[PDB]
Amino acid sequence: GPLGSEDDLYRQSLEIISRYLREQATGSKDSKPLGEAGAAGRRALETLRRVGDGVQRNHETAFQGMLRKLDIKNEGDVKSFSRVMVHVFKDGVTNWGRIVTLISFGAFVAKHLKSVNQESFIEPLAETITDVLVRTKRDWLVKQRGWDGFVEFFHVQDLEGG
């Protein structure tokens, strides 16, 4: 049925986004590792976790001004996320770092939404951030084998080049 000409990545992009945003919102480290998303999720949830911890420390100024400018009240405030969706890739040249900031913002905003006890809008929050993530950078995701590519860019563990 679903399997065919539909979207295979989206399924994953969601599996990992949920897994990531869920572990972030709670703040507690997940004990159960990946086992459905495949290879991407395994190295993604761990990579994204690290890049996120850094992104937040690197954007604390931006993140503070971005979320402060917004104000999640209902599922309608998600429109504000759409604004940052574009503002994230403001630069003509597309870089994984930019896409990392997008996932980094909503991920940080999700944990923020949970800090105020509004998980109600969180469920749709994650569903949107993901949709808008793979659906906004689909062409790229298709031109860069999506998920696998993301990790291809971050195939570095304890090594640094440039």
UniProtKB/Swiss-Prot annotation:
Q: Which domain of life is it from?
A: Eukaryota
Motif BH3 boundaries: 44-58
Covalent crosslink: Glycyl lysine isopeptide (Lys-Gly) (interchain with G-Cter in ubiquitin): 29, 32
Chain location of the short sequence motif BH1 per the record: 88-107
Compartments in which it is found: Membrane; Cytoplasm; Mitochondrion; Nucleus, Nucleoplasm
What's this protein's family per the entry? Answer: Belongs to the Bcl-2 family.
- Report the protein name in the record: Induced myeloid leukemia cell differentiation protein Mcl-1 homolog
Identify the gene encoding this protein. Mcl1
- Parent-protein residues present: 152 to 308 of 331
